[PDB]
């Protein structure tokens, strides 16, 4: 009976909540295959962009709030990374908790965002980091 609801929170048929997010990220296991392959995505950027068409996915999307909160939270965690697990008092919850990942571009997981930032920092490459980040955030959405 347990199934994904329209709140992105999975729950049983009667209504009792089991998880607030599918695995914490609400990403499909079938479509997770090429979300970490940053090299492959960079290589086929043009084909992936033609597939996704971000131009037609703007009038029904919000792009700024989720990205701002994600940057703030990322800086917060980086500042507080060298802290014990129990002492890490929560002031900024993960962006997925508040902003719907299916409606707010940039509301991605902490693991995916960390991997994307590490790849963009270690690999300095016409595609710039901004367009690649936007494409991969749309891919996550």
């Amino acid at each position: 009976g347990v199934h994904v609801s329209y709140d992105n929170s999975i729950r049983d048929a009667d209504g009792t909540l089991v998880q607030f997010m599918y695995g914490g990220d609400a990403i499909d296991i079938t479509k997770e295959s090429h979300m970490t392959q940053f090299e492959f995505c960079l290589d086929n950027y043009y084909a992936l962009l033609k597939k996704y068409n971000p131009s037609a996915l703007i009038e029904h999307l919000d792009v700024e709030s989720a990205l701002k909160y994600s940057k703030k939270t990322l800086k917060y965690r980086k500042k507080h990374s060298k802290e014990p697990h129990y002492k890490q008092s929560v002031k900024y919850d993960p962006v997925l908790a508040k902003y719907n990942p299916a409606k707010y571009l940039g509301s991605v997981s902490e693991n995916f965002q960390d991997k994307l930032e590490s790849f963009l920092d270690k690999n300095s490459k016409g595609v710039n980091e901004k367009k690649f980040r936007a494409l991969m955030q749309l891919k996550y959405m």
Binding site: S5, A56, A102, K103
Partner: protein, 101 residues
């Protein structure tokens, strides 16, 4: 004709109105899920097979499902999707606002 039915009708419509989520605050996925697309295509094909009026050019097509897919491509399907939330509240999206893929 009793008020013992008027009261029931009034309370039913009141509960239904309190259930509906206003268009200004629906917070679901703007995209059309695969299940929604499949159900819309099937229902439109059923209606076409039952002699409902069509809006697209029938370029030598005999499959109601194919006609439904053509209408969905042209975004001329006159159907409204009532997404249901776990408590009972619903948001009345239509195929026009919903974007495919």
């Amino acid at each position: 004709g009793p008020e013992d039915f008027q009261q029931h009708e009034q309370i039913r419509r009141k509960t239904l109105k309190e259930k509906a989520i206003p268009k200004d605050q629906r917070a679901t996925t703007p995209y059309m899920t695969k299940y929604e697309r499949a159900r819309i295509l099937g229902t439109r094909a059923l209606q076409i097979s039952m002699n409902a009026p069509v809006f697209v050019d029938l370029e030598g097509e005999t499959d109601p499902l194919r006609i439904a897919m053509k209408e969905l491509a042209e975004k001329k399907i006159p159907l409204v999707i009532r997404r249901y939330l776990p408590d009972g509240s619903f948001e009345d999206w239509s195929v026009e606002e919903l974007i495919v893929d």
